[PDB]
């Protein structure tokens, strides 16, 4: 193993495990009712319209909204 190398201590952790840091900073609240399990802004179920895909929770950016809406019959009702 290389000696003249950066110390790879938890770097993979900070990028690929943790708590979805960037998503949580923009969306601090959790879904409250039928949409429990999704993360979003504001109490109850208001500052939301987020989605969960094959891996982790992601922000439903317009690019993703179209990529899913054009393929699957999701009406994305707020």
């Amino acid at each position: 193993s290389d000696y003249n190398a950066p110390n790879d201590f938890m770097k993979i952790y900070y990028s690929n495990i943790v708590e979805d840091k960037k998503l949580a900073e923009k969306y601090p609240f959790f879904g409250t009712g039928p949409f429990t399990g999704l993360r979003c802004r504001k109490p109850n179920n208001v500052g939301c319209n987020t989605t969960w895909v094959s891996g982790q929770l992601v922000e439903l950016t317009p690019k993703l909204k179209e990529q899913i809406e054009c393929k699957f019959g999701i009406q994305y009702v707020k």
């Binding site: 708590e19 959790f30 949409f35 399990g37 969960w52």
Partner: protein, 54 residues
């Protein structure tokens, strides 16, 4: 008319396994998944969908 992709749980996604299950009927309000300290972290997801019936 596709059942897998919904707004609720999303696309191509399973709820995975359940460990440390709530055997009680009470909602057992969810404590957000977080890493508190470098040691003895759990990878068990909470029973998120266990309905707040009470």
């Amino acid at each position: 008319n596709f059942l897998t992709a919904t707004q609720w749980i999303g696309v191509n996604t399973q709820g995975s396994s359940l460990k440390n299950a709530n055997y009680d009927l009470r909602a057992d309000p969810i404590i957000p998944k977080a890493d508190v300290g470098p040691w003895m972290m759990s990878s068990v997801d909470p029973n998120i969908y266990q309905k707040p019936l009470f």
